[PDB]
Amino acid sequence: MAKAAAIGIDLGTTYSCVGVFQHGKVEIIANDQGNRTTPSYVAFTDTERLIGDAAKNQVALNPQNTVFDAKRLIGRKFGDPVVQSDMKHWPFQVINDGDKPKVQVSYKGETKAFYPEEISSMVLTKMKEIAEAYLGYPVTNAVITVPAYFNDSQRQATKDAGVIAGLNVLRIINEPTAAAIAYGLDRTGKGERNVLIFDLGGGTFDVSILTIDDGIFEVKATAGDTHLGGEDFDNRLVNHFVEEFKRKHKKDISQNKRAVRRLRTACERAKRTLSSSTQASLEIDSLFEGIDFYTSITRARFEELCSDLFRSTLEPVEKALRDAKLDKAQIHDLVLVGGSTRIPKVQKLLQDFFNGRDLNKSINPDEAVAYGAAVQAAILIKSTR
Numbered sequence: 001m002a003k004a005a006a007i008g009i010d011l012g013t014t015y016s017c018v019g020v021f022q023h024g025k026v027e028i029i030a031n032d033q034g035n036r037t038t039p040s041y042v043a044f045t046d047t048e049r050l051i052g053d054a055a056k057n058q059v060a061l062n063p064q065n066t067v068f069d070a071k072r073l074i075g076r077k078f079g080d081p082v083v084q085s086d087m088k089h090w091p092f093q094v095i096n097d098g099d100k101p102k103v104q105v106s107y108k109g110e111t112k113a114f115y116p117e118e119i120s121s122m123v124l125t126k127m128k129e130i131a132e133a134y135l136g137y138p139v140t141n142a143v144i145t146v147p148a149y150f151n152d153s154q155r156q157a158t159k160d161a162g163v164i165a166g167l168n169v170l171r172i173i174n175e176p177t178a179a180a181i182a183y184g185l186d187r188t189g190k191g192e193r194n195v196l197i198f199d200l201g202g203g204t205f206d207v208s209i210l211t212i213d214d215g216i217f218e219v220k221a222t223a224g225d226t227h228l229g230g231e232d233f234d235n236r237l238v239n240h241f242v243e244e245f246k247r248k249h250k251k252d253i254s255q256n257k258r259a260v261r262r263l264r265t266a267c268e269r270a271k272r273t274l275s276s277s278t279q280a281s282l283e284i285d286s287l288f289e290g291i292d293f294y295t296s297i298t299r300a301r302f303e304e305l306c307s308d309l310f311r312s313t314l315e316p317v318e319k320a321l322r323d324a325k326l327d328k329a330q331i332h333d334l335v336l337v338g339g340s341t342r343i344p345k346v347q348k349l350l351q352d353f354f355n356g357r358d359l360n361k362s363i364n365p366d367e368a369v370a371y372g373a374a375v376q377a378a379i380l381i382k383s384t385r
């Protein structure tokens with residue numbers, strides 16, 4: 001029953017996803033708000049602790065006590081220059097507890113501090129409860145994914161997050177490996193298969209090259225930009241609309257925090273529409289000083305606004321190919337991961353770079369990692385019996 005069941009969890013920097021392999025198919029499980037992905041956010045309020053959508057929805061009102069980006073801290077020392085650099089951009093407090101970072105917040109009127117693995121365990125507990133509500137029984141066995149470049153300390157702290165969350169961690173697997181499993185790229189018989197995973201998420205960009213020799217995976221190269229993702233494209237749209245509002249009304253909205261946030265969420269939505277329509281409309285009632293902001297933008301203008309950012313995704317692709325000592329024609333498969341890979345210009349740039357090649361994109365890119373993890377969790381729990 002529950003002991004013969006296992007889930008696959010993609011514990012992402014900005015969003016998390018949970019899947020279950022049953023009756024010959026993967027089911028990506030929708031949360032209680034009907035969403036197939038859940039924000040990796042934890043909010044501490046005057047009455048409760050919020051996780052996911054409810055935590056993301058109140059981030060504007062409670063920025064000091066809304067934790068996100070715990071994956072950027074997990075398994076790291078406080079003195080790490082990555083931690084020191086990132087801390088300058090977060091609205092929550094990061095403290096030092098014997099060279100280990102802790103996030104410090106106000107919860108129910110009291111000062112509390114949490115290890116990154118305790119924050120990630122609250123995200124994992126939520127994914128576990130989402131699976132349990134779908135299945136009708138508690139599931140405890142899980143496969144949890146991590147980036148291919150995570151070292152032993154980051155992998156161990158992720159497994160610790162799983163234990164705190166009440167999960168039996170069957171295995172910690174690499175995100176590009178789970179994505180290759182989702183597409184069945186390890187079941188092509190004999191002979192070495194070279195796979196490139198192009199993973200463009202909400203806040204990070206990763207390129208991974210894997211060799212699959214008779215079911216055995218080997219990471220040949222990892223490249224990317226830890227500070228490039230979908231949110232940079234939302235911000236390019238924000239700057240455009242701030243300049244358009246200034247041209248139409250001769251008023252600068254940039255300093256009004258509420259106006260900028262409402263414009264930001266509307267921009268994120270319009271950006272998503274631009275992946276399937278050639279135009280999107282913004283409909284903001286009383287954006288600033290009682291002025292409605294009803295406008296539109298073409299996909300052509302959006303592509304111009306992010307042109308340099310889209311083109312920059314090809315430098316880590318070339319870098320990974322040189323590190324792996326492989327030419328483009330030596331790559332057998334191209335896999336898309338992350339919601340931002342739905343952007344048509346991004347697909348066109350990657351396809352043209354690989355000389356007109358087909359892309360593996362039939363599985364929802366923001367769900368491919370959880371899909372593969374769910375497949376692996378089923379194989380692993382079956383072998384355990």
Ligand SMILES: Nc1ncnc2c1nc(Cl)n2[C@@H]1O[C@H](CO)[C@@H](O)[C@H]1O
Pocket residue numbers: 015200201202203229230231268271272273275338339340341342343366
């Ligand atoms: N249809 C889409 N077109 C463009 N961007 C998208 C789309 N869906 C998501 Cl999610 N994202 C973005 O992916 C990230 C999460 O993986 C977020 O930045 C989200 O906006």
